[PDB]
Write a protein that binds this ligand. Structure first.
Ligand SMILES: [Cl-]
Ligand SMILES: [Cl-]
Ligand SMILES: [Cl-]
Ligand SMILES: [Cl-]
Ligand SMILES: [Cl-]
Ligand SMILES: [Cl-]
Ligand SMILES: [Cl-]
Length: 129
């Protein structure tokens, strides 16, 4: 599923990401834009051979099982394929574990490089939330 910007903002808010560990909703929308272009089916191979899955490009090195990432963990206890669903529940619940891991949203290198320190509120501008 390719979400609309305000559609994804709405879905992330319902799932409790707005100010989760102090990250305002615009931070999550901005991260999703640059990670997936709001596409739940987005997959990208990392240089270490792991893969990033779904709207928030959650990596098989630590968070999900894809059966092909040697020496990896599955800390969200989920097949990586569950992160590609039109239903963002598994992506959001896993993201809550990631952002609680100590480094906050710096876990998402695209958030650090493209959203952090920017006017992220722009990402929810015009949205009925
Ligand atoms: Cl957009
Ligand atoms: Cl915001
Ligand atoms: Cl997703
Ligand atoms: Cl594996
Ligand atoms: Cl392994
Ligand atoms: Cl959803
Ligand atoms: Cl980046």
């Amino acid at each position: 599923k390719v979400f609309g910007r305000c559609e994804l903002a709405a879905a992330m808010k319902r799932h409790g990401l707005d100010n989760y560990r102090g990250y305002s909703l615009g931070n999550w929308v901005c991260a999703a834009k640059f990670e997936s272009n709001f596409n739940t089916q987005a997959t990208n191979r990392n240089t270490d051979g792991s893969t990033d899955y779904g709207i928030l490009q959650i990596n098989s090195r630590w968070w999900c099982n894809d059966g092909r990432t040697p020496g990896s963990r599955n800390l969200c206890n989920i097949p990586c394929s569950a992160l590609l669903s039109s239903d963002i529940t598994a992506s959001v619940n896993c993201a809550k574990k990631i952002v609680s891991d100590g480094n906050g949203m710096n876990a998402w290198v695209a958030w650090r490089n493209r959203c952090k320190g920017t006017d992220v509120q722009a990402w929810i501008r015009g949205c009925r939330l």
